[PDB]
Symmetry: C2
Subunit: 105 residues, 2 copies
C-alpha cells in the first residue's frame, strides 16, 4: 500500500512511525503523465516490501510540503530513514528507484 | 507585464490577443523555487520586449491546462506563434529561454 500524506504533521507522524525502516516518498500530481504511469509499480513494490514505508504527497493538495522539499519535477522520489534524507530521484525511472531502494533499505 | 491565464477559454483569449506575436507561456507553481527566481527576469523581459507576449499558468490553478501541455517540471516554457507550438523548455534556463525567444520572435 502507498499511504497518502494528508499534511505536514501527518508526514511527520508517518516518518516517526516508520522506525528504522527506509521511507520512500512519491511527490506527484494527478495531472502528470509520468506520475500516473509509475504509481501502479510503486503500489506493487509497496505490497511486496514490508520492510520499507511507501508514502505519497499530492503536490497540489500539499503545496507546503512540496515547497519544503524543493520539488520541481514530478514524480520526485525522496528517500528517508530516521528523519534523514538519503537520496532523491527526479523522474519515473523504475530501475533507478529499485537501485536506490536496494541501496538504502 | 505577465498575465496569468485564468482558464482554457482565457488561454485562447490571450493567444488571439497576441496577434502574430511570439507567445511565451510559463507553466509554474507558487511552491517551486526556480519558478520564483526566474519570474522577475520574465517580468523584466515582458516589460522590455514589445514584439513578444509573456503569459503564465499556475499548474495548481489550471491543472487541466497543465495536463494538456504534458507539464512535468517547473518552470516549463511553451513557445507559441499564431496558435502553433514552436518550442518548449523545461527548467529555469534563462539563456536558452532567451535563445528560443530570439529564434522564434
Amino acid at each position: 500500500m502507498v499511504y497518502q500524506v494528508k499534511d505536514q504533521e501527518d508526514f511527520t507522524k508517518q516518518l516517526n512511525e516508520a522506525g528504522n525502516k527506509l521511507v520512500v516518498i512519491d511527490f506527484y500530481a494527478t495531472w502528470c503523465g509520468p506520475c500516473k504511469m509509475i504509481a501502479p509499480k510503486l503500489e506493487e513494490l509497496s505490497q511486496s516490501m514490508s520492510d520499507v514505508v511507501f508514502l505519497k504527497v499530492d503536490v497540489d493538495e500539499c503545496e507546503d510540503i512540496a515547497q519544503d522539499n524543493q520539488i520541481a519535477c514530478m514524480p520526485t522520489f525522496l528517500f528517508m530513514k530516521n528523519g534523514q534524507k538519503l537520496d532523491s530521484l527526479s523522474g519515473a525511472n523504475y530501475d533507478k528507484l529499485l537501485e536506490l531502494v536496494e541501496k538504502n533499505k
